[PDB]
Structures are given as C-alpha cells and as structure tokens.
Design a protein around this ligand. Structure first.
Ligand code: ZN
Lengths: 430, 410
C-alpha cells in the first residue's frame, strides 16, 4: 500500500509497537537494549552511536585512520544527549519524506519494506523455515525497567544507527554467521546502517559542491535493497596496484559498489564479470525456488503460516506458479528484476530524477567534508527541492549545492579533527 | 636531516591491478543447436521502472511478531586503526615534487618566481613557475607607486595570455603541461610538442600497464548424426557466439582503459588545476609584499580594484582548464583507439581464423549428412567471418563529451 512515514519524539514513552527496547543483532544477547523507533514497517531507527566492533577510545581523533580513502572526521560528543538524539530522529523523518516525495524513491522504499529476509539460512534444511537466527529475528524487551526479563521477537528489514567514530563514513553492513552471509546467497538478511545527516561529502566537477543527504541516504538504501534480496554477491573485485610509490592504496572494490553508483562505472566491470555475477545470482534464486517447493514446517515458531510466507516469497523473487502449486523461475521476469535491482536503482539515475548534483565517478577526488548548518530550516533545505530551492533562486544549475553561492547552508570543518591518510615522500638522501 | 614532501593518498594515481580482470574469455565454449547469446546491458530505463507492475508488491506484508531469538551466534567484525602516515623513499621528481615547488611556507614574505626547478626545491623563498621567462621577470619587477597600478593590471593580464597558450596533428595542444608537472617520462626536459609528435599520449602516462588480452578459447561444436537442421543451427549459433566474444573483448579493453589509463589522465587534469592555482597564489603573495613596502601616504593615493583581479584570475584559470580538459580527454581516447583496441582486434582476428578452421573442419566431418550443401555452408562461413563487429564507445558511456572525441576517429 502507500508508504506511511511515522511521527514521534525521542521523549515519547515505550508502547511496544512503534517505540520499543530493541536488542540489535550485534549485541549478541548480552542485555544491551537500545530505544528503537519504527519509521516505516520493517524499518527501525536507533538514534545512537554505532559502537559494535569499535573501542570507546576509537571515537577520538588519533594519529591513525580506519580507511585510507576518506577524510575522516571524529566527534565523540555527537548524539550524547536526548535533545541531540531527537534532532536525529526528526532529520531522518524529513529525509524519508524527501525520498517518498517522488515515485522512484517511493518504489525504493516499498521494495525495501516488502523485501523481507527469507526465514532461513544455508544451514537450514530445505524442508524447513527457521526464524531463530540473528539475520532473521531481533528481540524486543517488554518488561518494566528492573524486572524479570521477558522478551518478544520481531521481524525487521533495516535498522538504522547513528554514525561510528567517523561521522562522514556511512556504511551498510550485513550479517555473517559462521563465515557465510545470507544477504549474499539469495536469502537476504536484516540490514544495518550507520548514518549521519549533518556531515556530508564534498565533490568538484573539473570538466566545489556539497552533497544532498537524502541522496547519500538513498545510496545506502540501494545497498540495503541488494542485501535484502540476497544479491550483494562477492565476485572478483577491482584491486589497486601497489607496487610503485605513485600508486594509491585502497581496499578491494566490489562490482556491487560500482553498480550502486551507476553511470559510467559499471563499465569498469567487464562483461565477463557481469555474467559471473548474473549466473551466481540466478543460481542462488534456483536454490530459493527449490526450498519453497519443499518447505513443510517451521520449528522455531508454530504461529508461522507456511502458505502465507510461500506466497510472499513468490511475490518477493517474482516466481511463477502453475495450476498445481509448483514454483519456478521465468527467465524474463528474473532478467527484468535483476536489471532493475542492479542497474535501475543507482545513485546516478536517482540524482537525475531528483535534480540533485552528484560526483561524476566513484574514483573522483574527495574533499574535506562540511557540516550542514540546519536541515530542519526550510529556507536552507526542503522536502520537495532539497538545497536547490527555487524561491531562493537556488534551483538553476544546482546553485543550492554550490559552495561559492550558498555560503549560508554550510560551515567548514576544523583541520584538527580531520584524519587524512598521507604519504611521506622522502628524497632518500641526507 | 630528512627531506620529505607530504602528499595525500587521494592525490596519487589509481591504477587497477592485472588481477582485477576476468580471464573467462580464455575458457572453451560448447556450441549446441539451441545455444543462445548472453548480453547484459549495464542499463535499465528509469521511466519503465516506475510504471512496471511486475515490481509492485502484490501480497500484503505479514505481521512482524514472532518467537524470541535464542541462538545469538553471529560474526561481529572488529575494527582497529592503522597509522595515517606511510614513509617512502625516491629520487624521482614527478608531479608531486613539481607541485610542491610551486608552494611556499607561511613565514616567508619576500618570494620570487624562477624557471629553475632545483632552485625552487632548495630555497624556501623561490617558487617554480612554468610560464615563459618573460612573464616571470615581469612578476619580479619593483615599480613606483603610480606605476604600480600599471604593473598589476598588466601582470594579471599577462597571466591570462600565458595560460591560454595553445597551438598545432589532431585537436589542440597545451605546451606547458610538461614543465608544470614532469609527469611520465622527462616531460619538463626537452620540447613538449616535439616529444608528443613522436610518441603521442603515451609519454604523459606515469605508468604504461600490461594489457590483459586473453586468447579466446576454442569452440567445441557437438555433432548430430543425420540431422541437417541441427548441424546448420550449430554453425549459426557458433557464428552468433563469435559476436558475443568480440563484444566481451571490447568490454574488457574498456574496463582496463577506464580503471588504468583514464584515471591517470584524471590526476593529470587535477594536477594542472592545482598548478594553475599555485601560480595565482604565488602572484597574489608577491603583490601583497610589494604593497606593504609602501607607506600609508603612498597606499592611500592609489585605490586598486581587487574585486576585478580575483575575477580575472578565476576566469583566466577557467579558460585554461577548458583547453587542458579538451587536450587531455583527446589524449585518453587517443591511447584507447591507438594503443589498446587494435591489439584486441588483432587477437580477435586470430580467433576468427581458428574458428574458420574449426567450422570448415566441422562441415568436413559432416559432409555426408549435409548431402550436396557442404560447399554452400563453406562459403556462408567464409563470407560471414569477413565482416567484423566495429567498436562503439557509446555502449559503455552514456550522455558524455568523450563520445565526441571517439567519433572523430576512422
Ligand atoms: Zn556504497
């Protein structure tokens, strides 16, 4: 149905419906419960710092870096108080309203909501549904504070956290169990995001400009979409040559990251690799279709109706049913769906449709990030037009995003809190 | 003491490794009567996606409520920091060292432009300039208070004229890119137009990479006893698959071009942008110093329009960058069409010959079941493999200015 974004404050009481105490997948059941807010069906916002896999001290600017590709900005006091956590929620609500304000973004969202993870894993027998895995189920606490622990399970598609140590490094992480990823095997799994709306990336087309946070969020939501469909597969990556001094160092770049950006970048992935991915994705779907024809019981939950979820997955992966009830893959349906998911929803295609300026390539030079003064101020940023507000004379030629023209929309960032990976080039003499 | 220049990792050259590109073209292919071609267009029309009913959710979303999670088995990733500094040692004087020679510390007030690169590295009050020595000496001349406005107007005017130097043999060429960066091979040394007229775009490249061009693997056609139709279809399918391999090879070359050559030329474009700025920054600090020499009486007499100067300098660079973009883009496509595609065509023509021999021999082995039509199919194979699939860059890049460069070629 039509996507409805919810309204709420951080101060609002827990009602165990739209506002809950959630035990996220990486908490490992260690009793670390977070206050969670359902923004749309199957999408949750936790307005707190992402601390999973990081050390408390890592949130401080040190003589080191996490990733060599990012101008890394640290700020430990971001989202440290209730008033600040509330700003986060309302900003996320405003960005979500910007997304659904055009049909394309609305489709992206409804894809995400309805693209529920398969109730299983590679370890689950074909004849079975199993909810009792961390990539499918997440616990909510329904007990009064300081009482006998009583928990209940909910299905979730996406959980959005605030940023980790580096504010401008927005990532979408998937869930691995015993060195295997359901969101890479056709099953799909609960997706998580570390996101920050205030501190955006900067670029400059040589042939600068600050980035619209709704696009940055949509970029990440595409990753989420791939993860929920179990098509974020690993294939031969682009690896940089590091044998010479003048060569840039970076991590392996997966095709999935280049498809997601879109534009000219998919051409860096060879037709051979294109076909390898396609085949793997098809071979995963063939497994799923086989499972649905064989699934009889659900051991972990007796209240799961088998026919309901058989019909839903059929509608998720667009399987075809004959008169007897057997499911199969219609090659044309799969091809259309594959190409829509991989080459339809892209940062470039979306930017064109949303009249937002973006960087030209993934391999473009990145510049120091900027803090957006106020996203809740409709003279700066709106739901319908973002920064490029026409009644402020900012629509033409992306004037609203231009750093020279719209100087009041942004503040520059102190060099003391920026961590850039530098190469020290010495003469080798003296 | 160590003499170390600092450079951001992002300002280095990205060059994709040889292991980044699939070798799958080298594999054998089975050709059967019902074998069909596989193309994956890296594109999907956005206007269809909105209207496509086959992507709207047709079943209601189930309730979220379920049984509690008890199996907390999960892999939690661990993040540790790595040092933000990496020390390296080289005797080379590439883009980075040539760009550093165009900078100055904050402490230094009295600076002068020079044409000697080594003197610009050594003394922290000399700054390297890549414009004509006629410009350089004009930027170092001290004048009277009344002649100061005649100096500024002229020197900023001279900056524009020096930045738009372009002569000459396809498209336009900027002769001071070599002096500005010394990128690739001894670019500052000797004449740039001469060195280019000999080797072309290749001398600008910091690293010439080994191209991956696999030998396309043999086709293995299956036999069908006494079935003329399946034999003919197999020959057809083999011929259509041949086109698939040409297309694939072209994709492989492009993927290597973009991630290996075109990235270098992007850096060189960014390098020139920095150089032109550093030159305008050096000119600004020179004017600043000469202005401060005067007394309050001399300064008040002549009101300099600084609003016009910054406008003139920004526009001066803007015109120059357009010329540099034009030349460098043409170079990047030049290298594709002259040093990359023809090498692949060569190997694809080899594939054609191997396939021709394959097919004729296959026709030879089935001459009995083909009745008296074996010669007919022989010439069909002969005629078809005489026509090749031409390369078109528009398949790999949408709505671009690089296609205009490509359409210029024969
Ligand atoms: Zn991404």
């Amino acid at each position: 149905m039509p996507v409805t974004i919810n309204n709420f404050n951080y101060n609002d009481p827990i009602d165990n419906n739209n506002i809950i105490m959630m035990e996220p997948p990486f908490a490992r059941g260690t009793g670390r419960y977070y206050k969670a807010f359902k923004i749309t069906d199957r999408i949750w916002i936790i307005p707190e710092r992402y601390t999973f896999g990081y050390k408390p001290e890592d949130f401080n600017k040190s003589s080191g870096i996490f990733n060599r590709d990012v101008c890394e900005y640290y700020d430990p006091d971001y989202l440290n108080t209730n008033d600040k956590k509330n700003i986060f929620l309302q900003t996320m609500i405003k960005l979500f309203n910007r997304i659904k304000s055009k049909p394309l973004g609305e489709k992206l969202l409804e894809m995400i909501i309805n693209g529920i993870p398969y109730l299983g894993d590679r370890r689950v027998p074909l004849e079975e549904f199993n909810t009792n895995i961390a990539s499918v189920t997440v616990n909510k606490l329904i007990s009064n504070p300081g009482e006998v622990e009583r928990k209940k399970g909910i299905f979730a598609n996406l959980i959005i956290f605030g940023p980790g140590p580096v504010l401008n490094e927005n990532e979408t992480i998937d869930i691995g169990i015993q060195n295997h990823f359901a969101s890479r095997e056709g099953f799909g799994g609960i997706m998580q995001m570390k996101f920050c709306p205030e501190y955006v990336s900067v670029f400059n087309n040589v042939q600068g400009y600050f980035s619209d946070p709704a696009l940055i969020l949509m970029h990440e939501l595409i990753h989420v979409l791939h993860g929920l469909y179990g098509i974020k597969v690993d294939d031969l990556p682009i690896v940089p040559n590091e044998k010479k001094f003048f060569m840039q160092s970076t991590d392996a770049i997966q095709a999935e990251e280049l498809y997601t950006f879109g534009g000219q970048d998919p051409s860096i992935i060879t037709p051979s690799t294109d076909k390898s991915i396609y085949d793997k994705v098809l071979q995963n779907f063939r497994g799923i279709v086989d499972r649905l024809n064989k699934v009889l019981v659900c051991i972990s939950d007796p209240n799961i109706n088998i026919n309901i979820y058989k019909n839903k997955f059929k509608d998720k992966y667009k399987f075809v049913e004959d008169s007897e009830g057997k499911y199969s893959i219609d090659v044309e349906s799969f091809d259309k769906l594959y190409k829509s998911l991989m080459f339809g929803f892209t940062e470039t295609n979306i930017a064109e449709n949303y009249k937002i300026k973006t960087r030209a390539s993934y391999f473009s030079d990145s510049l120091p990030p900027v803090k957006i003064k106020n996203l809740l101020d409709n003279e700066i940023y709106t739901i319908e037009e973002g920064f490029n507000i026409s009644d402020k004379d900012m629509e033409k030629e992306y004037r609203g995003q231009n750093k020279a023209i719209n100087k009041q929309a942004y503040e520059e960032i102190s060099k003391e809190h920026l961590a850039v990976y530098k190469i020290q080039m010495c003469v080798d003499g003296i | 003491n160590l003499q170390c220049i600092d450079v951001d990792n992002e300002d280095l050259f990205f060059i994709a490794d040889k292991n980044s590109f699939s070798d799958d073209l080298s594999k054998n292919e089975r050709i059967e009567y019902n074998t069909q071609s596989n193309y994956i267009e890296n594109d999907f029309p956005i206007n269809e996606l909105i209207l496509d009913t086959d992507l709207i959710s047709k079943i209601e979303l189930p309730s979220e409520n379920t049984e509690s999670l008890t199996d907390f088995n999960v892999d939690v990733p661990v993040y540790e920091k790595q040092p933000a500094i990496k020390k390296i040692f080289t005797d080379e004087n590439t883009i980075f060292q040539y760009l550093y020679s165009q900078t100055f510390p904050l402490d230094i007030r009295d600076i002068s432009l020079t044409s000697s690169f080594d003197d610009a590295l050594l003394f922290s009050n000399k700054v390297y300039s890549f414009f004509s020595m006629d410009y350089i000496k004009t930027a170092n001349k001290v004048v009277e208070a009344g002649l100061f406005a005649g100096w500024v107007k002229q020197i900023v005017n001279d900056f524009v004229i020096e930045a738009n130097k372009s002569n000459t043999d396809i498209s336009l060429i900027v002769p001071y890119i070599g002096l500005a960066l010394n990128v690739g091979n001894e670019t500052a040394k000797g004449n740039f137009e001469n060195a280019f007229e000999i080797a072309g775009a290749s001398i600008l490249l910091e690293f010439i990479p080994e191209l991956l061009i696999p030998v396309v693997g043999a086709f293995l056609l299956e036999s069908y006893i006494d079935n003329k139709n399946k034999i003919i279809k197999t020959i057809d399918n083999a011929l259509t698959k041949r086109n698939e391999k040409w297309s694939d090879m072209y994709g492989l070359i492009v993927a290597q071009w973009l991630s290996t050559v075109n990235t270098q030329f992007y850096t060189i474009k960014e390098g020139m942008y920095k150089a032109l700025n550093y030159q305008a920054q050096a000119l600004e600090e020179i004017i600043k110093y000469r202005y401060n020499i005067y007394s309050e009486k001399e300064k008040s007499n002549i009101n300099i329009d600084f609003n016009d100067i910054n406008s003139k300098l920004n526009e001066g660079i803007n015109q120059a960058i357009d010329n540099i973009n034009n030349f460098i883009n043409g170079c990047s496509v030049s290298y594709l069409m002259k040093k990359m595609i023809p090498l692949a065509v060569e190997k694809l023509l080899d594939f054609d010959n191997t396939l021709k021999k394959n097919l004729l021999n296959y026709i030879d082995e089935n001459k009995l079941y083909l009745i008296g039509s074996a010669e007919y199919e022989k010439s069909k194979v002969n005629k078809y493999l005489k026509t090749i699939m031409p390369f078109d860059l528009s398949i790999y890049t949408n709505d671009t200015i690089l296609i205009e460069m490509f359409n210029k070629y024969n």
